[PDB]
């Protein structure tokens, strides 16, 4: 090696060695992630250094939780991380397609072919595949049923069947609740609060908010039926003067006077709140709830509780907007001019105590534009798994709503794309037909992996499905229970169009870049 004569402590792989290393790493990653694909996938256990336990089958989570220190593995992990960040699904398919693309490319490269021709064929095949995907997508009106089908297709692959069935309703209802007509969906308005006291099937949707903190005063009411919500960001505790004030007195009476007079600033704001509460509700029938982002000292807590006001302090910053959209009031940074029109309304507010943790519920809102999903489970790892599943489901439903088109799943679209690529192959000049064939075979990995995970054999199931597609022309996928060809659209197995497009683009780009790498160097020391 040339560089080794300059930096002796350098590790270098050149020419076919770099390709061999990259393809070996990709094949190892693909072998690990093969068992993840499909609802028939296998649970994986992830034990951290500290002993934490995770139970996931996500491609991104598994990639982040294996003990791998390989460069190509890092590149594929970053690609999958981008896929998860933007689309929220398809990481396992991403890794599988990258690995199969590299394997099919090597199958021709090892026989004297240059990788550049393979990359040209990959580009042509990707263009044709994108055209076919445009031609095959199903534009539909995203009613509740289609969103439920998409949520099933995600959650069944993520969690147990019954838990998936519950999470489908939860996710779809939450998304439909927070969605405004002709407006981008803000997933920040769906709070995901997790409790650890009941079974996993008790996860539900609350048309309001759940706060992980409660009132700090024992005498405050634990339950208010008709409540006026005051969302505020005003400090109600003692605040020191910024310019080093200090006090100077000459007697105990003067010290007492100064002590009584140093609370007047906060007392004025507390009195303003109390006067507003008295004006708004002259009886004990209605209630008043104060949710403050900043702290409240015990003196103000006692003063408010003397008037029967429930006060919550140190709320999360996002809860300001969440309460504004749910209850309907307005967050106040000061009490300069506050009017009964700045108060939100909640049809029921109560506090729930669990161990050493106290929770506050805000339900029965008029028309909540922000809702929460209450994750419940007997174990921490169950809660983490359900959180990952609901994140995937929310991403899938949001993607389905964003563009009215949805793509049939179960690998039918991959089979049709491969068949179209094979048909289009003669139109490609030069030796790029080999790259086109490799791209088609790589696309065919998804039905192969689905059939293998379901317990059937790859070749027989694949040839059956391909023959059915050629004979009928429909979009026939993989039946994970019988192995026979099956129409994905009829049964309701749907895939996100954006997810498929991102898979094609990212997989092709990263495979082309990796195939063109001819040297791996580590000489920064």
């Amino acid at each position: 090696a040339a560089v080794k004569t300059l930096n002796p402590k350098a590790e270098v792989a050149r020419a076919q060695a770099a390709l061999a290393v990259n393809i070996s790493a990709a094949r190892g990653l693909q072998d690990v992630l093969r068992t993840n694909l499909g609802p028939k996938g296998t649970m994986k256990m992830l034990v951290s250094g500290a002993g934490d336990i995770k139970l996931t089958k996500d491609g991104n989570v598994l990639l982040h939780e294996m003990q791998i220190q390989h460069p190509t593995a890092s590149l594929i992990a970053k690609v999958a991380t981008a896929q998860d960040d933007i689309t929220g699904d398809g990481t396992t398919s991403n890794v599988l397609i990258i690995g199969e693309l590299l394997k099919q490319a090597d199958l021709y490269i090892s026989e004297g072919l240059h990788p550049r021709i393979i990359t040209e064929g990959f580009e042509a095949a990707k263009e044709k595949a994108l055209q076919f995907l445009e031609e095959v997508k199903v534009s539909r009106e995203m009613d509740r049923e289609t969103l439920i089908d998409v949520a099933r297709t995600s959650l069944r692959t993520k969690v147990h069947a019954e838990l998936a069935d519950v999470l489908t309703e939860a996710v779809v209802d939450s998304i439909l609740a927070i969605k405004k007509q002709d407006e981008p969906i803000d997933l920040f308005m769906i709070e995901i609060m997790e409790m650890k006291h009941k079974s996993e099937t008790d996860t539900s949707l609350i048309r309001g908010l759940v706060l992980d903190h409660g009132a700090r005063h024992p005498d405050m009411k634990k339950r208010v039926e008709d409540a006026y919500i005051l969302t505020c960001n005003v400090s109600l505790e003692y605040e020191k003067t910024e310019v080093n004030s200090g006090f100077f007195y000459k007697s105990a009476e003067e010290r007492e006077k100064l002590v009584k007079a140093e609370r007047k600033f906060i007392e004025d704001r507390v009195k303003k709140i109390i006067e507003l509460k008295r004006k708004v509700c002259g009886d004990s029938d209605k209630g008043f709830v104060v949710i403050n982002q900043k702290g409240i000292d015990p003196f103000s807590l006692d003063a408010l509780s003397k008037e029967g006001i429930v006060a919550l302090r140190r709320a999360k910053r996002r809860n300001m907007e969440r309460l504004t959209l749910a209850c309907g009031g307005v967050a106040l940074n000061s009490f300069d001019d506050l009017s009964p029109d700045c108060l939100g309304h909640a049809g029921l507010v109560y506090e729930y105590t669990l161990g050493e943790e106290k929770f506050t519920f805000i339900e029965k809102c008029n028309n909540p534009r922000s809702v929460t999903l209450l994750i419940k489970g007997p174990n921490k790892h169950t809660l983490t798994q359900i959180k990952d599943a609901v994140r995937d489901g929310l991403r899938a439903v949001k993607n389905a709503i964003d563009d009215g088109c949805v793509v049939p799943g179960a690998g039918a679209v991959e089979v049709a794309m491969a068949e179209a690529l094979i048909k289009h192959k003669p139109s490609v000049k030069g030796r790029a037909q080999l790259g086109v064939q490799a791209f088609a075979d790589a696309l065919l990995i998804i039905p192969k992996v689905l059939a293998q995970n379901s317990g059937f054999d790859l070749q027989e199931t694949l040839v059956k499905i391909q023959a059915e597609h050629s004979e009928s022309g429909q979009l026939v996928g993989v039946d994970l229970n019988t192995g026979e060809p099956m129409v994905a659209a009829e049964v309701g197995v749907w895939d996100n169009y954006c997810v498929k497009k991102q898979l094609l683009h990212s997989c092709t780009v990263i495979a082309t870049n990796i195939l063109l790498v001819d040297e791996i160097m580590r000489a920064g020391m």
């Binding site: 460069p71 100064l258 940074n333 000061s334 870049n513 791996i520 020391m525």
Partner: protein, 526 residues
């Protein structure tokens, strides 16, 4: 005891003679060989593993050279000249390295033949002067008003990179960004793409969605949710001073002896904040961007006037916003003027991309700053795309400053070599031999192009030389992808004259610098 007596300190090595020259030339040749294969449209990419754990998948010569560590000082000099070439003109970083390596390789021959390095240096300097003359002679003019020619130039600059697949979009982005950054004031032309042409990478999406904005884009959100996230025609006020209450410079201590002084002090703090926000509001703006924090009370007073506030923005981003929307950054709002109010932005939109909020001030009219929003597969791909776009923008600004063009693909090298040989035919002294040697050493670029293309080097070079021996064949290069000789008047591969001049100058001067050197001494401290 009785430690040895020494003149120089310990661990002080010293080599001398032919060994030092041979070692320097071998180090330069090894540096050239490292990136020899990364030249031409058929160049392969390399993976670099950073000591911090990062991966740099790149085709650029300068990045590869700067990502490695070497101990031989000649290799350090080669890395330094690569960085110099990258900083001066933008591209040509591997061509200059290859040229310097070849020049030192051909100078070693004469060094071994009882020729003093000063003679070789004088011949090299004469050759460099004649190379400059010939390059200026064979150049062609270009009108910057023709957008098609500029796009073709940028394309020929980026055909050798990984962005050649989306070359058209890349060229349009680079040309638009360079054109809109171009600015003049007080009779001083300025094209500052380092500061006012920002490239932002957000992984995900497709590269076809990447575009240059008629404005700026920052990773910021409103300080308070009530503030509007969408304003059609906003009046922008820029600040670089806190909207909070802060202690003074002098050591100030209050002394409270009365009951009402504490509350009075707090109320005056609030009133000072209110007066500051009133001074803001007096100009009636729509959005307020500040480099320092904004207090919650200030946010309330601003929302009372229906004003969107952005809390903490970097200095460079604030300067970009000022250039784009025509604002002027101020510090004391009591001195705010109407001229400081930034009007010209056609839209302010804050939309969530992925899981993060981003602020768009796009749709500006006559913006002097831009943000190139890059979307792609991952971070490494986007980094390589950004490097290619930087190369394209540097080539565009070089063409804008210097409208001359010279043929590419080795045609310029062959033409200059032939002219140098013809001039040397009349030389009679001993200096002619190194003169011809460097003249033919200039032919390494077409040879490397042929080698990377995979064709036959010897017969293609011989045919190209025979073609260049004719009269009107100065533009005859070689395809980097089909391995055939073509006239570049037809292929269209042209490169800026400035890039070629800088490459030849740097290569020759590096050869001179490493030829002047003998008696390496090492080991001493500072």
């Amino acid at each position: 005891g009785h430690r040895p007596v020494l003149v120089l300190s310990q661990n002080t090595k010293r080599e001398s003679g032919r060994k030092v020259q041979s070692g320097n030339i071998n180090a330069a040749k090894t540096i050239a060989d490292i990136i020899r294969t990364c030249l031409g449209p058929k160049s392969m990419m390399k993976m670099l593993l950073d000591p911090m754990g990062g991966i740099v998948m790149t085709n650029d010569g300068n990045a590869i050279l700067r990502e490695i560590q070497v101990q031989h000082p000649a290799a350090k000099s080669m890395i330094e000249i690569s960085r110099t070439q990258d900083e001066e003109v933008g591209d040509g970083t591997t061509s200059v390295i290859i040229l310097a390596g070849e020049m030192l390789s051909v100078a070693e021959h004469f060094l071994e033949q009882q020729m003093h390095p000063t003679v070789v240096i004088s011949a090299y300097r004469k050759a460099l002067d004649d190379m400059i003359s010939t390059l200026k002679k064979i150049s062609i003019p270009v009108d910057i008003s023709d957008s098609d020619m500029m796009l073709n130039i940028i394309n020929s600059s980026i055909t050798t990179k990984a962005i050649s697949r989306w070359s058209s979009l890349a060229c349009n982005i680079a040309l638009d960004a360079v054109k809109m950054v171009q600015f003049e004031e007080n009779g001083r032309k300025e094209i500052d793409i380092k500061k006012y042409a920002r490239v932002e990478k957000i992984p995900g999406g497709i590269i076809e969605d990447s575009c240059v904005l008629r404005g700026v884009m920052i990773n910021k959100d409103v300080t308070h949710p009530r503030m509007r996230r969408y304003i059609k025609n906003p009046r922008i006020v820029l600040l670089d001073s806190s909207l909070e209450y802060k202690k003074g410079e002098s050591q100030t201590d209050i002394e409270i002896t009365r009951e009402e002084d504490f509350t009075r002090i707090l109320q005056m703090e609030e009133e000072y904040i209110q007066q500051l926000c009133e001074d803001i509001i007096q100009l009636k703006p729509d959005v307020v961007i500040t480099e320092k924090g904004i207090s919650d009370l200030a946010q309330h007073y601003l929302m009372r006037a229906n004003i969107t506030a952005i809390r903490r923005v970097r200095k460079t981003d604030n300067n970009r916003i000022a250039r784009a929307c025509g604002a002027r950054i101020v510090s004391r709002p009591e001195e705010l003027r109407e001229d400081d109010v930034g009007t010209g932005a056609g839209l302010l939109e804050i939309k969530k991309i992925g899981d993060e909020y981003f602020t768009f001030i796009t749709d500006c009219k006559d913006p002097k700053a831009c943000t190139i929003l890059l979307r792609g597969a991952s971070k490494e791909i986007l980094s390589e795309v950004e490097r290619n776009l930087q190369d394209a923008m540097q080539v565009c600004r070089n063409v804008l400053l210097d409208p001359q063009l010279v043929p590419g693909g080795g045609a310029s090298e062959m033409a200059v070599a032939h002219a140098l040989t013809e001039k040397s035919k009349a030389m009679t002294g001993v200096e002619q031999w190194p003169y011809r040697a460097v003249a033919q050493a200039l032919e390494v670029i077409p040879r490397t192009l042929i080698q990377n293309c995979g064709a036959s080097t010897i017969r293609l070079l011989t045919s190209l030389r025979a073609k260049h021996t004719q009269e009107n064949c100065e533009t005859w290069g070689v395809n980097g992808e089909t391995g055939t000789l073509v006239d570049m008047k037809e292929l269209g591969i042209w490169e800026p004259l400035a890039v070629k001049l800088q490459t030849y100058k740097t290569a020759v001067e590096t050869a001179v610098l490493l030829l002047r050197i003998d008696d390496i001494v090492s080991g001493h401290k500072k």
